[PDB]
mmCIF file of C-alpha atoms and ligand atoms in Angstrom:
data_model
loop_
_atom_site.group_PDB
_atom_site.id
_atom_site.type_symbol
_atom_site.label_atom_id
_atom_site.label_comp_id
_atom_site.label_asym_id
_atom_site.label_seq_id
_atom_site.Cartn_x
_atom_site.Cartn_y
_atom_site.Cartn_z
ATOM 1 C CA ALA M 1 39.505 9.434 11.719
ATOM 2 C CA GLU M 2 41.686 6.469 12.769
ATOM 3 C CA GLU M 3 39.017 4.105 14.113
ATOM 4 C CA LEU M 4 35.917 5.935 12.882
ATOM 5 C CA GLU M 5 37.417 5.820 9.381
ATOM 6 C CA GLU M 6 38.518 2.198 9.647
ATOM 7 C CA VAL M 7 35.194 1.418 11.319
ATOM 8 C CA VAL M 8 33.299 2.979 8.401
ATOM 9 C CA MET M 9 35.281 0.813 5.986
ATOM 10 C CA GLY M 10 34.229 -2.200 8.042
ATOM 11 C CA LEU M 11 30.615 -1.000 8.031
ATOM 12 C CA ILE M 12 30.699 -0.394 4.284
ATOM 13 C CA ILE M 13 32.175 -3.831 3.733
ATOM 14 C CA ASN M 14 29.688 -5.357 6.178
ATOM 15 C CA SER M 15 26.797 -3.583 4.468
ATOM 16 C CA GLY M 16 28.131 -4.752 1.106
ATOM 17 C CA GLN M 17 28.446 -8.341 2.341
ATOM 18 C CA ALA M 18 24.930 -8.103 3.738
ATOM 19 C CA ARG M 19 23.530 -7.110 0.355
ATOM 20 C CA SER M 20 25.668 -9.758 -1.326
ATOM 21 C CA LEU M 21 24.209 -12.400 0.983
ATOM 22 C CA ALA M 22 20.706 -11.021 0.401
ATOM 23 C CA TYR M 23 21.050 -11.241 -3.397
ATOM 24 C CA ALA M 24 22.542 -14.700 -2.947
ATOM 25 C CA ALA M 25 19.535 -15.571 -0.777
ATOM 26 C CA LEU M 26 17.268 -14.460 -3.612
ATOM 27 C CA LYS M 27 19.267 -16.540 -6.076
ATOM 28 C CA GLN M 28 18.676 -19.588 -3.871
ATOM 29 C CA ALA M 29 14.951 -18.863 -4.050
ATOM 30 C CA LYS M 30 15.104 -18.798 -7.845
ATOM 31 C CA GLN M 31 16.654 -22.269 -7.694
ATOM 32 C CA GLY M 32 13.616 -23.311 -5.640
ATOM 33 C CA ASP M 33 15.732 -23.679 -2.491
ATOM 34 C CA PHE M 34 13.537 -22.035 0.149
ATOM 35 C CA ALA M 35 15.540 -23.598 2.983
ATOM 36 C CA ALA M 36 18.852 -22.112 1.875
ATOM 37 C CA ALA M 37 17.168 -18.805 1.070
ATOM 38 C CA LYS M 38 15.681 -18.588 4.570
ATOM 39 C CA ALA M 39 19.051 -19.412 6.162
ATOM 40 C CA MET M 40 20.848 -16.808 4.048
ATOM 41 C CA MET M 41 18.265 -14.153 4.911
ATOM 42 C CA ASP M 42 18.659 -14.833 8.620
ATOM 43 C CA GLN M 43 22.428 -14.436 8.468
ATOM 44 C CA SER M 44 22.078 -11.271 6.396
ATOM 45 C CA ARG M 45 19.706 -9.826 9.013
ATOM 46 C CA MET M 46 22.131 -10.689 11.820
ATOM 47 C CA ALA M 47 24.988 -9.043 9.912
ATOM 48 C CA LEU M 48 22.909 -5.880 9.482
ATOM 49 C CA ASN M 49 21.813 -5.942 13.107
ATOM 50 C CA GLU M 50 25.425 -5.968 14.278
ATOM 51 C CA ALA M 51 26.279 -3.254 11.766
ATOM 52 C CA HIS M 52 23.280 -1.165 12.841
ATOM 53 C CA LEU M 53 24.262 -1.581 16.493
ATOM 54 C CA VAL M 54 27.731 -0.227 15.764
ATOM 55 C CA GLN M 55 26.231 2.694 13.847
ATOM 56 C CA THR M 56 23.843 3.394 16.753
ATOM 57 C CA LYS M 57 26.878 3.964 18.980
ATOM 58 C CA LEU M 58 28.427 6.070 16.243
ATOM 59 C CA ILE M 59 25.291 8.283 16.248
ATOM 60 C CA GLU M 60 24.806 8.490 20.050
ATOM 61 C CA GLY M 61 28.372 9.734 20.532
ATOM 62 C CA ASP M 62 28.653 11.605 17.247
ATOM 63 C CA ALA M 63 29.740 14.622 19.306
ATOM 64 C CA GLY M 64 33.327 15.580 20.172
ATOM 65 C CA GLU M 65 34.718 17.434 17.147
ATOM 66 C CA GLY M 66 32.188 20.242 17.521
ATOM 67 C CA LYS M 67 28.826 21.239 18.974
ATOM 68 C CA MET M 68 26.349 21.260 16.076
ATOM 69 C CA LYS M 69 28.659 19.476 13.613
ATOM 70 C CA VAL M 70 29.092 15.691 13.572
ATOM 71 C CA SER M 71 31.405 13.119 11.953
ATOM 72 C CA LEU M 72 31.019 13.375 8.175
ATOM 73 C CA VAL M 73 31.572 9.652 7.627
ATOM 74 C CA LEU M 74 28.462 8.984 9.713
ATOM 75 C CA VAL M 75 26.524 9.566 6.516
ATOM 76 C CA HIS M 76 28.655 7.228 4.474
ATOM 77 C CA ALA M 77 27.939 4.421 6.929
ATOM 78 C CA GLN M 78 24.283 5.472 7.217
ATOM 79 C CA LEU M 79 23.855 5.624 3.439
ATOM 80 C CA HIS M 80 25.337 2.166 2.942
ATOM 81 C CA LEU M 81 23.562 0.669 5.947
ATOM 82 C CA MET M 82 20.194 2.226 5.075
ATOM 83 C CA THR M 83 20.455 1.058 1.472
ATOM 84 C CA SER M 84 21.528 -2.460 2.445
ATOM 85 C CA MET M 85 18.852 -2.858 5.135
ATOM 86 C CA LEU M 86 16.134 -1.614 2.796
ATOM 87 C CA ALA M 87 17.323 -3.825 -0.049
ATOM 88 C CA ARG M 88 17.446 -6.854 2.205
ATOM 89 C CA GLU M 89 13.903 -6.227 3.494
ATOM 90 C CA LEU M 90 12.554 -5.842 -0.036
ATOM 91 C CA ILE M 91 14.499 -8.885 -1.179
ATOM 92 C CA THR M 92 12.880 -10.800 1.682
ATOM 93 C CA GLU M 93 9.479 -9.780 0.316
ATOM 94 C CA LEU M 94 10.583 -10.809 -3.175
ATOM 95 C CA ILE M 95 11.641 -14.218 -1.847
ATOM 96 C CA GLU M 96 8.273 -14.650 -0.128
ATOM 97 C CA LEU M 97 6.638 -13.929 -3.492
ATOM 98 C CA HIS M 98 8.743 -16.661 -5.100
ATOM 99 C CA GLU M 99 7.352 -18.997 -2.453
ATOM 100 C CA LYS M 100 3.799 -17.917 -3.276
ATOM 101 C CA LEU M 101 4.573 -18.447 -6.984
ATOM 102 C CA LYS M 102 4.792 -22.080 -5.823
ATOM 103 C CA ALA M 103 8.189 -22.600 -7.502
ATOM 104 C CA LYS D 1 24.758 2.440 37.725
ATOM 105 C CA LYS D 2 21.256 2.985 36.407
ATOM 106 C CA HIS D 3 20.447 2.754 32.693
ATOM 107 C CA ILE D 4 18.618 5.671 31.137
ATOM 108 C CA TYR D 5 17.579 4.868 27.558
ATOM 109 C CA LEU D 6 16.130 7.506 25.194
ATOM 110 C CA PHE D 7 14.203 6.641 21.980
ATOM 111 C CA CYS D 8 13.639 8.575 18.575
ATOM 112 C CA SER D 9 13.426 7.314 14.959
ATOM 113 C CA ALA D 10 17.161 6.911 14.126
ATOM 114 C CA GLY D 11 18.838 8.010 17.397
ATOM 115 C CA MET D 12 20.580 11.221 16.215
ATOM 116 C CA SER D 13 18.866 14.455 17.023
ATOM 117 C CA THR D 14 18.507 12.925 20.500
ATOM 118 C CA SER D 15 22.186 11.993 20.371
ATOM 119 C CA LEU D 16 23.085 15.628 21.009
ATOM 120 C CA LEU D 17 20.848 15.633 24.143
ATOM 121 C CA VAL D 18 22.476 12.358 25.315
ATOM 122 C CA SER D 19 25.984 13.867 25.038
ATOM 123 C CA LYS D 20 24.941 16.892 27.174
ATOM 124 C CA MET D 21 23.258 14.642 29.759
ATOM 125 C CA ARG D 22 26.464 12.540 30.040
ATOM 126 C CA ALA D 23 28.467 15.750 30.663
ATOM 127 C CA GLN D 24 26.112 16.731 33.480
ATOM 128 C CA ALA D 25 26.097 13.265 35.010
ATOM 129 C CA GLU D 26 29.911 13.425 35.153
ATOM 130 C CA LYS D 27 29.971 16.919 36.626
ATOM 131 C CA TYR D 28 27.678 15.836 39.525
ATOM 132 C CA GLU D 29 28.900 12.218 39.866
ATOM 133 C CA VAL D 30 25.494 10.682 39.072
ATOM 134 C CA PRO D 31 25.993 6.893 38.592
ATOM 135 C CA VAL D 32 24.104 6.457 35.327
ATOM 136 C CA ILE D 33 24.639 5.073 31.825
ATOM 137 C CA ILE D 34 22.774 7.055 29.095
ATOM 138 C CA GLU D 35 22.149 5.708 25.532
ATOM 139 C CA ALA D 36 19.970 6.863 22.583
ATOM 140 C CA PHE D 37 18.244 4.353 20.269
ATOM 141 C CA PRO D 38 15.711 4.482 17.428
ATOM 142 C CA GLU D 39 12.076 3.818 18.431
ATOM 143 C CA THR D 40 12.222 0.428 16.677
ATOM 144 C CA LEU D 41 14.333 -0.963 19.534
ATOM 145 C CA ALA D 42 12.059 0.278 22.411
ATOM 146 C CA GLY D 43 10.862 -3.237 23.093
ATOM 147 C CA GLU D 44 14.192 -4.990 22.665
ATOM 148 C CA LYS D 45 16.472 -2.473 24.440
ATOM 149 C CA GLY D 46 13.872 -1.125 26.895
ATOM 150 C CA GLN D 47 13.901 -4.418 28.820
ATOM 151 C CA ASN D 48 17.347 -3.489 30.166
ATOM 152 C CA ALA D 49 16.681 0.113 31.054
ATOM 153 C CA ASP D 50 15.986 1.385 34.508
ATOM 154 C CA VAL D 51 13.920 4.224 32.998
ATOM 155 C CA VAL D 52 12.582 4.596 29.440
ATOM 156 C CA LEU D 53 12.319 8.119 28.006
ATOM 157 C CA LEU D 54 10.480 8.866 24.722
ATOM 158 C CA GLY D 55 11.381 11.795 22.489
ATOM 159 C CA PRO D 56 8.597 14.424 22.083
ATOM 160 C CA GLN D 57 7.986 13.360 18.453
ATOM 161 C CA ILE D 58 7.027 9.847 19.567
ATOM 162 C CA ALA D 59 4.731 10.835 22.444
ATOM 163 C CA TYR D 60 1.726 9.325 20.635
ATOM 164 C CA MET D 61 3.416 5.923 21.124
ATOM 165 C CA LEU D 62 3.376 6.138 24.963
ATOM 166 C CA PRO D 63 0.442 3.706 25.547
ATOM 167 C CA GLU D 64 2.005 1.064 23.269
ATOM 168 C CA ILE D 65 5.407 1.283 24.916
ATOM 169 C CA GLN D 66 3.817 1.106 28.401
ATOM 170 C CA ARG D 67 2.052 -2.177 27.431
ATOM 171 C CA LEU D 68 5.319 -3.519 25.949
ATOM 172 C CA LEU D 69 7.315 -2.745 29.130
ATOM 173 C CA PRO D 70 4.778 -3.106 32.017
ATOM 174 C CA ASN D 71 7.606 -3.393 34.550
ATOM 175 C CA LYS D 72 9.494 -0.191 33.638
ATOM 176 C CA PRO D 73 8.772 3.489 34.280
ATOM 177 C CA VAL D 74 8.170 5.023 30.822
ATOM 178 C CA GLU D 75 7.721 8.699 30.101
ATOM 179 C CA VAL D 76 7.915 11.407 27.464
ATOM 180 C CA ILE D 77 10.668 14.028 27.603
ATOM 181 C CA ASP D 78 9.404 17.552 28.131
ATOM 182 C CA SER D 79 9.366 19.199 24.666
ATOM 183 C CA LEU D 80 10.872 22.490 25.887
ATOM 184 C CA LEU D 81 13.676 20.748 27.769
ATOM 185 C CA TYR D 82 14.273 18.669 24.646
ATOM 186 C CA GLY D 83 14.228 21.541 22.154
ATOM 187 C CA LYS D 84 16.597 23.570 24.322
ATOM 188 C CA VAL D 85 18.907 20.530 24.701
ATOM 189 C CA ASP D 86 18.865 20.856 28.517
ATOM 190 C CA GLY D 87 21.109 17.997 29.596
ATOM 191 C CA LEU D 88 20.823 18.837 33.304
ATOM 192 C CA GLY D 89 17.044 19.251 33.232
ATOM 193 C CA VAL D 90 16.358 15.955 31.473
ATOM 194 C CA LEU D 91 18.879 14.162 33.671
ATOM 195 C CA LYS D 92 16.907 15.487 36.690
ATOM 196 C CA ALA D 93 13.575 14.240 35.291
ATOM 197 C CA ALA D 94 15.054 10.788 34.684
ATOM 198 C CA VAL D 95 16.487 10.402 38.189
ATOM 199 C CA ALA D 96 13.099 11.577 39.517
ATOM 200 C CA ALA D 97 11.179 8.968 37.513
ATOM 201 C CA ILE D 98 13.505 6.322 38.980
ATOM 202 C CA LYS D 99 12.973 7.506 42.594
ATOM 203 C CA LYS D 100 9.238 7.932 42.239
ATOM 204 C CA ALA D 101 9.313 4.361 40.852
ATOM 205 C CA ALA D 102 11.283 2.714 43.656
ATOM 206 C CA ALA D 103 8.800 4.233 46.150
ATOM 207 C CA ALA G 1 19.704 24.129 14.440
ATOM 208 C CA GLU G 2 16.605 24.923 16.538
ATOM 209 C CA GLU G 3 13.868 24.432 13.934
ATOM 210 C CA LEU G 4 15.944 22.795 11.192
ATOM 211 C CA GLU G 5 17.038 20.208 13.768
ATOM 212 C CA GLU G 6 13.559 19.733 15.201
ATOM 213 C CA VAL G 7 12.192 19.786 11.652
ATOM 214 C CA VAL G 8 14.607 17.027 10.611
ATOM 215 C CA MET G 9 13.430 14.931 13.560
ATOM 216 C CA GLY G 10 9.874 15.443 12.329
ATOM 217 C CA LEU G 11 10.923 14.512 8.792
ATOM 218 C CA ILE G 12 12.749 11.418 10.020
ATOM 219 C CA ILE G 13 9.723 10.410 12.054
ATOM 220 C CA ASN G 14 7.409 11.215 9.144
ATOM 221 C CA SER G 15 9.588 9.215 6.757
ATOM 222 C CA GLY G 16 9.640 6.364 9.270
ATOM 223 C CA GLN G 17 5.854 6.485 9.656
ATOM 224 C CA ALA G 18 5.523 6.523 5.877
ATOM 225 C CA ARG G 19 7.570 3.342 5.567
ATOM 226 C CA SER G 20 5.685 1.806 8.481
ATOM 227 C CA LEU G 21 2.399 2.514 6.713
ATOM 228 C CA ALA G 22 3.840 1.176 3.452
ATOM 229 C CA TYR G 23 4.894 -2.129 5.050
ATOM 230 C CA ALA G 24 1.514 -2.248 6.769
ATOM 231 C CA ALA G 25 -0.093 -1.672 3.363
ATOM 232 C CA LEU G 26 1.851 -4.647 2.024
ATOM 233 C CA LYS G 27 0.762 -6.744 4.993
ATOM 234 C CA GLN G 28 -2.864 -5.942 4.137
ATOM 235 C CA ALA G 29 -2.202 -7.205 0.616
ATOM 236 C CA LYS G 30 -0.866 -10.484 1.998
ATOM 237 C CA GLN G 31 -4.150 -10.859 3.881
ATOM 238 C CA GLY G 32 -5.887 -10.450 0.513
ATOM 239 C CA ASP G 33 -7.245 -7.027 1.502
ATOM 240 C CA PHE G 34 -6.627 -4.984 -1.648
ATOM 241 C CA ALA G 35 -9.002 -2.240 -0.500
ATOM 242 C CA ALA G 36 -7.159 -1.581 2.752
ATOM 243 C CA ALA G 37 -3.813 -1.886 0.984
ATOM 244 C CA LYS G 38 -4.818 0.748 -1.579
ATOM 245 C CA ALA G 39 -6.043 3.109 1.155
ATOM 246 C CA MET G 40 -2.828 2.683 3.137
ATOM 247 C CA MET G 41 -0.630 3.399 0.100
ATOM 248 C CA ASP G 42 -2.582 6.561 -0.649
ATOM 249 C CA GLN G 43 -2.090 7.888 2.869
ATOM 250 C CA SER G 44 1.561 6.870 2.807
ATOM 251 C CA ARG G 45 2.018 8.780 -0.476
ATOM 252 C CA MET G 46 0.336 11.873 0.981
ATOM 253 C CA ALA G 47 2.588 11.710 4.049
ATOM 254 C CA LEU G 48 5.671 11.597 1.821
ATOM 255 C CA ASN G 49 4.363 14.359 -0.403
ATOM 256 C CA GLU G 50 4.023 16.668 2.585
ATOM 257 C CA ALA G 51 7.441 15.575 3.827
ATOM 258 C CA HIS G 52 8.979 16.092 0.380
ATOM 259 C CA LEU G 53 7.384 19.539 0.155
ATOM 260 C CA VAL G 54 8.982 20.541 3.447
ATOM 261 C CA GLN G 55 12.342 19.208 2.271
ATOM 262 C CA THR G 56 11.978 21.137 -1.014
ATOM 263 C CA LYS G 57 11.837 24.359 1.011
ATOM 264 C CA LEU G 58 14.766 23.138 3.072
ATOM 265 C CA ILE G 59 16.785 22.703 -0.162
ATOM 266 C CA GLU G 60 15.697 25.959 -1.892
ATOM 267 C CA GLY G 61 16.783 28.071 1.092
ATOM 268 C CA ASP G 62 19.647 25.810 2.171
ATOM 269 C CA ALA G 63 21.828 28.931 2.091
ATOM 270 C CA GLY G 64 22.518 31.266 5.024
ATOM 271 C CA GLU G 65 25.308 29.658 7.062
ATOM 272 C CA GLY G 66 27.773 29.946 4.186
ATOM 273 C CA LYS G 67 28.152 30.336 0.429
ATOM 274 C CA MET G 68 29.087 26.901 -0.935
ATOM 275 C CA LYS G 69 28.284 25.005 2.280
ATOM 276 C CA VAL G 70 24.743 23.966 3.223
ATOM 277 C CA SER G 71 22.920 22.568 6.266
ATOM 278 C CA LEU G 72 24.422 19.166 7.111
ATOM 279 C CA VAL G 73 21.105 17.759 8.335
ATOM 280 C CA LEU G 74 19.706 18.279 4.847
ATOM 281 C CA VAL G 75 21.226 14.871 4.190
ATOM 282 C CA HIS G 76 19.628 13.150 7.339
ATOM 283 C CA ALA G 77 16.284 14.233 5.910
ATOM 284 C CA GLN G 78 17.140 13.516 2.256
ATOM 285 C CA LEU G 79 18.541 10.075 3.074
ATOM 286 C CA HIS G 80 15.483 9.105 5.098
ATOM 287 C CA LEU G 81 13.028 10.666 2.660
ATOM 288 C CA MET G 82 14.713 9.175 -0.416
ATOM 289 C CA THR G 83 14.823 5.731 1.176
ATOM 290 C CA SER G 84 11.207 5.901 2.353
ATOM 291 C CA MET G 85 9.885 7.194 -0.980
ATOM 292 C CA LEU G 86 11.765 4.534 -2.911
ATOM 293 C CA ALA G 87 10.644 1.810 -0.514
ATOM 294 C CA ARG G 88 7.014 2.803 -0.908
ATOM 295 C CA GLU G 89 7.193 2.861 -4.697
ATOM 296 C CA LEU G 90 8.694 -0.608 -4.775
ATOM 297 C CA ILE G 91 6.230 -1.809 -2.150
ATOM 298 C CA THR G 92 3.437 -0.430 -4.333
ATOM 299 C CA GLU G 93 4.768 -2.538 -7.204
ATOM 300 C CA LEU G 94 4.987 -5.540 -4.873
ATOM 301 C CA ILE G 95 1.357 -5.013 -3.845
ATOM 302 C CA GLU G 96 0.306 -4.837 -7.498
ATOM 303 C CA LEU G 97 2.075 -8.169 -8.017
ATOM 304 C CA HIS G 98 0.089 -9.671 -5.138
ATOM 305 C CA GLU G 99 -3.031 -8.544 -6.980
ATOM 306 C CA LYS G 100 -1.813 -10.203 -10.178
ATOM 307 C CA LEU G 101 -1.054 -13.357 -8.158
ATOM 308 C CA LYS G 102 -4.860 -13.367 -7.836
ATOM 309 C CA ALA G 103 -4.727 -13.827 -4.043
ATOM 310 C CA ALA I 1 32.174 23.978 -6.994
ATOM 311 C CA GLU I 2 32.153 24.967 -10.690
ATOM 312 C CA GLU I 3 32.500 21.540 -12.318
ATOM 313 C CA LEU I 4 31.914 19.379 -9.245
ATOM 314 C CA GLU I 5 28.637 21.264 -8.713
ATOM 315 C CA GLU I 6 27.642 21.113 -12.372
ATOM 316 C CA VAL I 7 28.858 17.511 -12.492
ATOM 317 C CA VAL I 8 26.662 16.602 -9.512
ATOM 318 C CA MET I 9 23.673 18.143 -11.290
ATOM 319 C CA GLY I 10 24.488 15.951 -14.282
ATOM 320 C CA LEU I 11 24.823 12.916 -12.010
ATOM 321 C CA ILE I 12 21.539 13.700 -10.272
ATOM 322 C CA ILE I 13 19.836 14.112 -13.626
ATOM 323 C CA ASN I 14 21.518 10.962 -14.942
ATOM 324 C CA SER I 15 20.487 9.021 -11.845
ATOM 325 C CA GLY I 16 16.960 10.379 -12.221
ATOM 326 C CA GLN I 17 16.850 9.403 -15.901
ATOM 327 C CA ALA I 18 18.157 5.968 -14.971
ATOM 328 C CA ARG I 19 15.319 5.434 -12.512
ATOM 329 C CA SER I 20 12.851 6.866 -15.014
ATOM 330 C CA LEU I 21 14.036 4.365 -17.617
ATOM 331 C CA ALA I 22 13.904 1.570 -15.033
ATOM 332 C CA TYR I 23 10.286 2.352 -14.093
ATOM 333 C CA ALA I 24 9.510 2.638 -17.797
ATOM 334 C CA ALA I 25 11.160 -0.763 -18.265
ATOM 335 C CA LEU I 26 8.854 -2.163 -15.595
ATOM 336 C CA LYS I 27 5.857 -0.571 -17.293
ATOM 337 C CA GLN I 28 6.817 -2.370 -20.512
ATOM 338 C CA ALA I 29 6.823 -5.632 -18.559
ATOM 339 C CA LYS I 30 3.303 -4.938 -17.308
ATOM 340 C CA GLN I 31 2.245 -4.562 -20.940
ATOM 341 C CA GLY I 32 3.720 -8.029 -21.514
ATOM 342 C CA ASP I 33 6.579 -6.592 -23.586
ATOM 343 C CA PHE I 34 9.582 -8.524 -22.266
ATOM 344 C CA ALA I 35 11.723 -7.510 -25.243
ATOM 345 C CA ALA I 36 11.298 -3.781 -24.674
ATOM 346 C CA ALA I 37 11.673 -4.249 -20.925
ATOM 347 C CA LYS I 38 14.991 -6.066 -21.385
ATOM 348 C CA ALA I 39 16.270 -3.366 -23.758
ATOM 349 C CA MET I 40 15.280 -0.599 -21.346
ATOM 350 C CA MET I 41 17.017 -2.283 -18.397
ATOM 351 C CA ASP I 42 20.206 -2.664 -20.416
ATOM 352 C CA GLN I 43 20.275 1.027 -21.286
ATOM 353 C CA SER I 44 19.469 1.947 -17.689
ATOM 354 C CA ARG I 45 22.408 -0.175 -16.503
ATOM 355 C CA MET I 46 24.758 1.481 -18.996
ATOM 356 C CA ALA I 47 23.590 4.915 -17.833
ATOM 357 C CA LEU I 48 24.245 3.940 -14.211
ATOM 358 C CA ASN I 49 27.596 2.403 -15.087
ATOM 359 C CA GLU I 50 28.769 5.631 -16.708
ATOM 360 C CA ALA I 51 27.411 7.619 -13.775
ATOM 361 C CA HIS I 52 29.087 5.281 -11.276
ATOM 362 C CA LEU I 53 32.376 5.567 -13.174
ATOM 363 C CA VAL I 54 32.253 9.351 -12.903
ATOM 364 C CA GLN I 55 31.469 9.102 -9.192
ATOM 365 C CA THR I 56 34.379 6.663 -8.724
ATOM 366 C CA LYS I 57 36.732 9.382 -9.973
ATOM 367 C CA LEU I 58 34.964 11.873 -7.739
ATOM 368 C CA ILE I 59 35.681 9.599 -4.733
ATOM 369 C CA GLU I 60 39.295 8.671 -5.631
ATOM 370 C CA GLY I 61 40.289 12.338 -5.900
ATOM 371 C CA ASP I 62 37.879 13.637 -3.255
ATOM 372 C CA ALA I 63 40.895 15.304 -1.625
ATOM 373 C CA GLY I 64 42.123 18.856 -2.267
ATOM 374 C CA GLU I 65 39.986 21.155 -0.106
ATOM 375 C CA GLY I 66 41.279 19.582 3.102
ATOM 376 C CA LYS I 67 42.916 16.520 4.634
ATOM 377 C CA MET I 68 40.160 14.596 6.435
ATOM 378 C CA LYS I 69 37.277 16.567 4.892
ATOM 379 C CA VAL I 70 35.902 15.821 1.418
ATOM 380 C CA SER I 71 33.525 17.440 -1.098
ATOM 381 C CA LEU I 72 30.073 17.680 0.503
ATOM 382 C CA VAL I 73 28.258 17.132 -2.792
ATOM 383 C CA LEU I 74 29.900 13.709 -3.018
ATOM 384 C CA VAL I 75 27.077 12.503 -0.803
ATOM 385 C CA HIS I 76 24.441 14.156 -2.900
ATOM 386 C CA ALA I 77 25.663 12.225 -5.951
ATOM 387 C CA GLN I 78 26.220 9.051 -3.905
ATOM 388 C CA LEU I 79 22.737 9.217 -2.393
ATOM 389 C CA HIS I 80 21.074 9.622 -5.780
ATOM 390 C CA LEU I 81 23.311 7.071 -7.489
ATOM 391 C CA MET I 82 22.973 4.496 -4.698
ATOM 392 C CA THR I 83 19.194 4.885 -4.637
ATOM 393 C CA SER I 84 18.878 4.686 -8.425
ATOM 394 C CA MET I 85 21.182 1.664 -8.755
ATOM 395 C CA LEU I 86 19.388 -0.195 -5.974
ATOM 396 C CA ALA I 87 15.970 0.668 -7.366
ATOM 397 C CA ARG I 88 16.940 -0.478 -10.834
ATOM 398 C CA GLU I 89 18.313 -3.791 -9.516
ATOM 399 C CA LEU I 90 15.132 -4.468 -7.564
ATOM 400 C CA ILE I 91 13.029 -3.411 -10.535
ATOM 401 C CA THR I 92 14.993 -5.913 -12.622
ATOM 402 C CA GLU I 93 14.008 -8.612 -10.128
ATOM 403 C CA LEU I 94 10.401 -7.407 -10.274
ATOM 404 C CA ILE I 95 10.470 -7.632 -14.074
ATOM 405 C CA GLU I 96 11.839 -11.176 -13.882
ATOM 406 C CA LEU I 97 8.914 -12.025 -11.594
ATOM 407 C CA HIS I 98 6.489 -10.655 -14.187
ATOM 408 C CA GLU I 99 8.102 -13.046 -16.652
ATOM 409 C CA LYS I 100 7.640 -15.947 -14.236
ATOM 410 C CA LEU I 101 4.007 -14.856 -13.757
ATOM 411 C CA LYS I 102 3.798 -15.928 -17.416
ATOM 412 C CA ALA I 103 2.111 -12.652 -18.428
HETATM 413 O O1 PO3 L 201 18.175 9.569 14.556
HETATM 414 P P1 PO3 L 201 17.002 10.515 14.684
HETATM 415 O O2 PO3 L 201 17.227 11.904 15.240
HETATM 416 O O3 PO3 L 201 15.657 10.145 14.081
#
């Protein structure tokens, strides 16, 4: 719907940017730049946190259209957000490994 | 306005209970704000609640949440009231926990 | 619905616990405790297996409400289960890498 | 529906094969076969690319049944495709790490 739909687009974009930053963070690690990697990870986390917060509201008040049924787009945002958050967490682990690899 | 915060894993299945509680609170002019959150935010969000309610699936976490929020009344939602999605009943239990807490 | 909804909550919680155990398993690896890591992964796998089995039934008999349409929640469970299972598998690989790193 | 349903099955299978190839690619890396790993990742990517292209069409023309509503299966394909693509990308990173580990 109007906002919900436009909001989902924002969430999808936000989730996409989050992943983008995460991969970029990893790239920094490959260059041996732990400082930049750490900074990029932090920002990515913050972006996800804000996105997750918005989704939380979208799940708490998912009612309105019907009793049992909920907004369909909720999944689209959840799918993107869940994937991005998971990827970012794993990427964080991968970056930590790069640090252990010494490089 | 008192803050009643409910926790579950993602904040959905409890989202339906939250919407029914809000309807009841409006019908009887109870000055409360009700929000659902995933269990991962119990320590971060719980600090601002006036009463912390745990979904029946996360009852085993009660002792941990009590130690995390030693200055807040924390309790598990009755499983029957929860399964039946009794907005009025759970709203009553929450107001009670607040009263029994202030005296 | 009644069970399906309560079942999904259980699945979401189970999936969440599975991931939690998986991350914990990884943490053990970081401490250089391969034995505990291995044990944690095994339990995590078993938890998912049981969860997946329940979902399998939920997909085989997804009919009833309508012909083409299926239970909407099937996705809340699939999304969480798919994410958790994938996370664990990758985490398992990450743990194996820690072992190769000698540490 | 007829095609959409059969198409989703193909996408699910394709996504599954993609992951299978990806894990196999990783296995090659463990055997110290970087050449075979690289070849397997490339094929996996191509498989995903073709699958993603098909999904793109399935999202651009997701209309028809209703205005706001879209094909339910779209999620099923998206969920599998998103998971597979993400997994493969992470696996690629894992393989690169194996290369850095010298082995
Ligand atoms: O969001 P939830 O019902 O675990």
